[PDB]
């Protein structure tokens, strides 16, 4: 969903890239330090702006 110019809840409400963006994107899942049996609720997001 996150991309230069793409619309969405994160784009409209969180870190949004500009139309003319140059760089590289790296993605990977790290359950080593993010998996909590009770829930790793500290990773928060905003959905009302």
């Amino acid at each position: 969903q996150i991309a230069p110019g793409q619309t969405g809840n994160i784009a409209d409400y969180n870190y949004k890239l500009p139309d003319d963006f140059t760089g590289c994107v790296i993605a990977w899942n790290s359950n080593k330090l993010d998996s909590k049996v009770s829930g790793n609720y500290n990773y928060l997001y905003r959905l009302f702006r």
């Binding site: 230069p4 110019g5 793409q6 139309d19």
Partner: protein, 49 residues
């Protein structure tokens, strides 16, 4: 010839104004639809065409 010159000029102007409606194999023939109905990164090619 006096009629011919004026007729040629009128025909040239009419052709020039008529060729505006051509889409040139693009999404639409007006700028607002291109700018509002598509992502700008992939609308740049259409507007440039």
């Amino acid at each position: 010839k006096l009629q011919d010159v004026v007729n040629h000029n009128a025909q040239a102007l009419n052709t020039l104004v008529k060729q505006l409606s051509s889409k040139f194999g693009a999404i639409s023939s007006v700028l607002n639809d291109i700018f509002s109905r598509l992502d700008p990164p992939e609308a740049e090619v259409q507007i440039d065409r």
